[PDB]
Amino acid sequence: YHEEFARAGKQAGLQVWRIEKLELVPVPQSAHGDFYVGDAYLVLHTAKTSRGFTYRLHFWLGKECSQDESTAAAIFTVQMDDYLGGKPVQNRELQGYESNDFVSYFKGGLKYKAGGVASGLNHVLTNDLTAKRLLHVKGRRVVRATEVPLSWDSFNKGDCFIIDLGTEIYQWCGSSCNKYERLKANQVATGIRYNERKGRSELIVVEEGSEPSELIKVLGEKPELPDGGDDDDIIADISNRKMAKLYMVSDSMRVTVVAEENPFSMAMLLSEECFILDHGAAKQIFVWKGKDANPQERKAAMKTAEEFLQQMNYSKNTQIQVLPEGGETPIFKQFFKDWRD
């Protein structure tokens, strides 16, 4: 019913919408990758196949968005899903914990902008040039630029920071950060100048201990810098250990174990029921919904999955992927020894 659903999934490519006071508002192509820290988004990826149209539906939740702001995103995803006839694959995306597939849609990386709809902020593209902000650039695999308070308190020796003053962008490189971190932060700074300023802006690379007068004017005198925190985010352990479990959901919700170790057999998946493939140790849980399974139980898959994490004492930041029968992902299918299409 909401106007945009009519625009959704018509042709191949990526479509980003931001939930603005219970309404779907498109996010322009240039703004793709920028997400407000206090907002909820809907990301739809359309793939053309011979005949077929394959959908990868994602709902991104901001760190500062409310419980009710999060609820609206979940409803919109359910409405979008049945609007697309239960053909799409749904994913709950959490800020700083989003999946590889979601991450792969934005080549320049992710930009976490402070504020949101409550601060009156828009994705409406502007020449701008009046901007004053600070971006903390972190991550080796995935480049994440986070909007941090524009002061020396945010700073650390081991990382790269981008001071965006509008007409000029400063790439502050910490004394103890390597070549890879410098290049990645540069790509973000080049991204602002070209994408947001149209190349009018000027890029100045700044070294710690050598900051210009303009920088120390806004920021003030530079004090001692804390040693760069080593994030060393958890990386999947490679072994011959079979860490996945197969569960069947029996309506609150009751989980019954099907298989105590992967590889699973395709026959275990019954069209009459909803299943949970647990790979919680590797940060991923999958909700497989049978074609002849109860429709009310199918719609509550996201809620069922969140309850599963809580019951099995997993982190609330575990990746949730909801799959319809026949719309299984290559990652889900590979847990099976006898997968047949």
Author numbering: 6 to 256, 260 to 349
Kindly provide excerpts from the paper associated with this entry:
Adseverin (also known as scinderin) is a member of the gelsolin superfamily of Ca2+-dependent actin-binding proteins, which regulate cytoskeletal dynamics by severing, bundling and capping of actin filaments. Adseverin was first identified in chromaffin cells of bovine adrenal medulla, where it acts as an actin depolymerizing agent that disassembles the cortical network of actin filaments in response to bursts of intracellular calcium, leading to exocytosis of secretary vesicles.
We crystallized A1–A3 in the presence of EGTA, revealing a compact auto-inhibited structure similar to the conformational state observed in inactive full-length gelsolin. Purified recombinant A1–A3, supplemented with 5 mM EGTA, crystallized in space group C2 and its structure was solved by molecular replacement using the structure of G1–G3 excised from inactive full-length gelsolin as the search model and refined to a resolution of 2.9 Å. In this inactive conformation, the long α-helix of A3 is kinked to enable the formation of the A1/A3 latch, resulting in the masking of the major actin-binding interface on A1. The structure appears to be relatively rigid, with B-factors indicating that flexibility is limited mainly to the extended A2A3 linker and the short α-helices of A1 and A2. The iA1–A3 crystal lattice is stabilized by a number of crystal contacts, including a relatively large packing interface of ∼1,518 Å2. Interestingly, comparisons with full-length gelsolin show that this interface largely buries the surfaces in iA1–A3 that bind the C-terminal half of the molecule, suggesting that the crystal environment partially mimics the inactive full-length protein.
